[PDB]
UniProtKB/Swiss-Prot annotation:
GO cellular component, one term: host cell postsynaptic membrane
Record function comment: Alpha-conotoxins act on postsynaptic membranes, they bind to the nicotinic acetylcholine receptors (nAChR) and thus inhibit them. This toxin blocks neuronal alpha-3-beta-2/CHRNA3-CHRNB2 (human and rat), alpha-7/CHRNA7 (human and rat), and alpha-3-beta-4/CHRNA3-CHRNB4 (human) nAChRs. Acts voltage-independently. Competes with alpha-bungarotoxin for binding to the receptor. Binds to a different site than alpha-conotoxin ImII. Is highly active against the neuromuscular receptor in frog. Also exhibits inhibition of D.melanogaster alpha-7 nAChRs.
Name of this protein: Alpha-conotoxin ImI
Subcellular location: Secreted
Site positions per UniProt: Important for binding to human alpha-7 nAChR: 5-7, 9-10
Family of the protein in this entry: Belongs to the conotoxin A superfamily.
Modified residues (Cysteine amide): 12
Keywords: Acetylcholine receptor inhibiting toxin, Amidation, Cleavage on pair of basic residues, Disulfide bond, Ion channel impairing toxin, Neurotoxin, Postsynaptic neurotoxin, Secreted, Toxin
Domain statement: The cysteine framework is I (CC-C-C). Alpha4/3 pattern.
GO molecular function: acetylcholine receptor inhibitor activity; ion channel regulator activity; toxin activity
Tissues where the protein occurs: Expressed by the venom duct.
Note: This toxin is a substrate for a multienzyme complex that regulates its folding and assembly. This complex is composed of protein-disulfide isomerase (PDI), peptidyl-prolyl cis-trans isomerase (PPI) and immunoglobulin-binding protein (BiP). PDI catalyzes the oxidation and reduction of disulfide bonds. Oxidative folding rates are further increased in the presence of PPI with the maximum effect observed in the presence of both enzymes. In contrast, BiP is only observed to assist folding in the presence of microsomes, suggesting that additional cofactors are involved. Negative results: does not inhibit alpha-2-beta-2, alpha-4-beta-2, alpha-2-beta-4, alpha-3-beta-4, and alpha-4-beta-4 subunits. Also has no effect on muscle nAChRs alpha-1-beta-1-delta-epsilon.
Disulfide bonds: 2-8, 2-12, 3-8, 3-12
Length: 12
């Protein structure tokens, strides 16, 4: 999932 991108680790 997108948690591996900092720009999607806010609320992932």
């Amino acid at each position: 999932g997108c948690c591996s991108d900092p720009r999607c680790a806010w609320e992932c």
